[model samples]
Target: CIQRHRSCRKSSECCGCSVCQCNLFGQNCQCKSGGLIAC
Candidate 1:
């Protein structure tokens, strides 16, 4: 599975390890620590 903060094209690339998002920067896998709280 691809590590966090790595480049990715599809969500499957992350393999449940991270989230794949395509933004202005481009497609990337990011793993957020813990649940949502505050910025």
Candidate 2:
């Protein structure tokens, strides 16, 4: 998954989010174990 340029509350743990390109801020959350499905 790609790294986040912005910042969010759910950081460190990847948010199993299926969409970030559009959400933009959605990519704020980080990954822990492996990372998002395709952030």
Candidate 3:
């Protein structure tokens, strides 16, 4: 299970843009803007 999870994480790091964008929050990126806000 651990190995499968790790492999999924690795695959996400290679092809996931949303996951990569997560790190940008509160730095050069804003969470409340860009249509991501709930209210």
Best by TM-score: 1
Q: Candidate 3 — which residues are off by over 4 angstroms?
A: 1-27, 33-39
Scored by lDDT, the top model is: 1
Task: Give the 10-residue window scoring lowest on summed lDDT in candidate 3.
Answer: 30-39
**Candidate 2 C-alpha lDDT tens digits along 2-39:** 33543344444233442223246554353333345544
Residue pairs in collision within model 2: 13-30, 14-31
Instruction: Score candidate 1 by lDDT.
Output: 0.52
TM-scores, all candidates, are 0.43, 0.19, 0.13
Each candidate: RMSD: 5.2, 9.2, 10.6
lDDT of candidate 1 over 1-39, digit per residue (tens): 765456666655664445556667663445332223431
- Kindly indicate the candidate among 2 and 3 with the higher lDDT: 2
Best first by lDDT, ranked: 1, 2, 3
Clash counts per candidate, in order, are 0, 2, 0
What is each predicted model's overall lDDT from 0 to 1?
0.52, 0.40, 0.26
Please identify model 2 stretches exceeding 4 Å from their true place: 1-3, 12-39
